[PDB]
Amino acid sequence: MTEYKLVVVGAGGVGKSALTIQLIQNHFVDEYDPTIEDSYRKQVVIDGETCLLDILDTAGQEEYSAMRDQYMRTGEGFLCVFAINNTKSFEDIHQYREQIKRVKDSDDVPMVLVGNKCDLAARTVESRQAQDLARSYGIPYIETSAKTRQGVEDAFYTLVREIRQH
Ligand SMILES: Nc1nc2c(ncn2[C@@H]2O[C@H](COP(=O)(O)OP(=O)(O)NP(=O)(O)O)[C@@H](O)[C@H]2O)c(=O)[nH]1
Ligand SMILES: [Ca+2]
Ligand SMILES: [Ca+2]
Ligand SMILES: [Mg+2]
Numbered sequence: 001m002t003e004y005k006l007v008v009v010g011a012g013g014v015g016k017s018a019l020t021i022q023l024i025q026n027h028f029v030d031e032y033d034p035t036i037e038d039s040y041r042k043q044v045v046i047d048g049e050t051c052l053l054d055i056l057d058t059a060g061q062e063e064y065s066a067m068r069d070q071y072m073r074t075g076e077g078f079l080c081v082f083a084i085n086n087t088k089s090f091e092d093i094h095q096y097r098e099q100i101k102r103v104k105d106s107d108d109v110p111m112v113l114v115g116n117k118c119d120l121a122a123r124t125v126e127s128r129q130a131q132d133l134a135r136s137y138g139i140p141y142i143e144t145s146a147k148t149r150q151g152v153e154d155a156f157y158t159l160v161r162e163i164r165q166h
Contacts, residue, residue, distance in 0.1 A: 001043070003052040004160050007072055009096050010081035011089035012060035015116040018146030019081065020057045023156050028147045034061045037071050046160050053156070072103045077110035077163040079155060082130075084115045084143065085122040090130065097137065110162040111139045114155050118143040 008016040017038070018029045024040045040055040056075060059065045072078075078100050082089040093113065100109050113134040115125060127143070134141035140158055144151035 001050050001052060003054060004163055005054045005056070005074060005076040006079065006156065006159055007056040007058060007075035007077070008079045008081060009058050009068075009072065009100070010060055010079075010114075011083075011086065011092045012062075014060065014081045014083040014086060014089045015144075015146045016060060016079075016081050017057050019079075019114070019116060019144060019152055019155070020055050022146045022149060022152050024055070034064050035059050036064050037068070046157050051160070053160075055156075069099065069103050072100065075100075075104075077112075077159045079112055079114050079159055081114045081116050082125065083117045084125045085117055085120050087124045090115075090125045090133075093133065108166065110159065110166050111137065112155060112159045112162060113137070113139055113141045114151075115141065115143045116146060118150060119145040119147050 008020055010016055017035055021029050024042050035057055036059055038057040042053050056071050058068050080093050080096050082093055115130050130141045142151050142155045144155050
């Protein structure tokens with residue numbers, strides 16, 4: 001049994017908590033309670049390997065973000081989340097990527113770009129734009145919905161598969 005330390009980052013309200021809770025607890029959180037710093041742990045079998053996921057759900061709200069960098073340091077792979085109906089959250093990804101590079105002191109950190117809320121039709125970030133951003137970082141882009149479960153396993157398990165490539 002291997003442990004994978006995953007960290008979920010991104011702007012306030014994009015659905016980091018809802019994603020993590022859908023993965024771990026199999027329900028959708030409809031309300032919006034801003035996070036400070038929460039952790040989740042679960043044993044899961046991923047590609048035939050029994051492993052322990054330790055997931056750090058981080059704050060996106062500036063007001064709640066004290067010491068996020070000290071949490072982020074510990075991470076082995078990052079889910080960089082934006083919402084497909086929130087163009088500013090997508091623009092913000094560059095700054096999260098810069099933060100991750102600064103806390104890991106590496107240009108080569110396991111990451112997945114996640115476009116969440118794909119159940120919603122008020123899309124302002126087209127798939128291709130995010131594909132392009134992810135291509136520039138040499139990482140995958142995956143769309144998710146914490147509400148329907150679309151892509152949610154695939155996002156987190158892809159991040160583990162990325163960690164295994166480094
Ligand atoms: N339709 C839809 N709503 C979503 C989805 N994911 C999250 N939401 C909603 O968006 C709001 C914010 O979600 P939440 O998970 O709290 O966002 P967050 O990124 O963790 N916010 P913070 O950074 O403040 O902790 C909630 O009302 C939640 O139900 C999704 O995939 N689809
Ligand atoms: Ca609910
Ligand atoms: Ca550093
Ligand atoms: Mg949250």
